[PDB]
């Protein structure tokens, strides 16, 4: 079956595990986050295509084994939290790590501004749109809490993989 291997990266506590578990289990993780990084699989229909997603949840430095885990990704979600400025600034470092590991400057990737249920945001949508457009990648706002945008972010990443 058609399989899309996706990897979720970004700074601590931006919601990588929460986005992943929302996609897989439709559940919002409140207190019990996996903390230990794992791989999750699910058969979904994306734009009429039945396919399998394998999602690797990553930890929020450099490791040869982490490169080995990341090298298997076909596409990447770079997640920040819209109420945490440092996590947005950190996006540059995660994108640099992907480019190195994939040996490419055009890796299928989506910028994810998570926690968009929080109207008390420190990163404005316009700033993230600017950054995304300068990278040449989509930008999607998500909430793992309300589930808004969650499937949109993963499926848009699949679309980027398809057209690469």
Residues making contact with ligand GNP (CB under 6 A):
12-18, 29-30, 33, 59-60, 114-115, 117-118, 143-145
- Which residues are paired to 46 by β-bridges? 49
> Can residue 17 be called a binding residue for Mg ion (CB under 5 A)?
yes
The interface partner of residue 29, options being ligand GNP, Mg ion, Ca ion, none and the CB cut-off 5 to 8 Å by kind, is ligand GNP
d(CA 104, CA 139): 20
Q: How far is the CB of 26 from Ca ion (least distance, A)?
A: 24
Compose the 3-42 pattern: x for residues touching Ca ion by CB under 5 A, - for all others. x---------------------------------------
Q: Which residues bind Mg ion (CB under 5 A)?
A: 16-17
């Amino acid at each position: 079956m058609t399989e899309y291997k996706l990897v979720v990266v970004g700074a601590g506590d931006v919601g990588k595990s929460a986005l992943t578990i929302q996609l897989i289990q439709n559940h919002f993780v409140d207190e019990y986050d996996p903390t230990i990084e794992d791989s999750y699989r699910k058969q979904v229909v994306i734009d009429g295509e039945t396919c399998l997603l394998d999602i690797l949840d990553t930890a929020g430095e450099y490791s040869a084994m982490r490169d080995q885990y990341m090298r298997t990704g076909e596409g990447f979600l770079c997640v920040f939290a819209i109420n945490n400025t440092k996590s947005f600034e950190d996006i540059h470092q995660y994108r640099e790590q992907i480019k190195r590991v994939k040996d490419s400057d055009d890796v299928p990737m989506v910028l994810v501004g998570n926690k968009c249920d929080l109207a008390a945001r420190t990163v404005e949508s316009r700033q993230a749109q600017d950054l995304a457009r300068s990278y040449g990648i989509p930008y999607i706002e998500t909430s793992a809490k309300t589930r808004q945008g969650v499937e949109d972010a993963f499926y848009t990443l699949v679309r980027e993989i398809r057209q690469h």
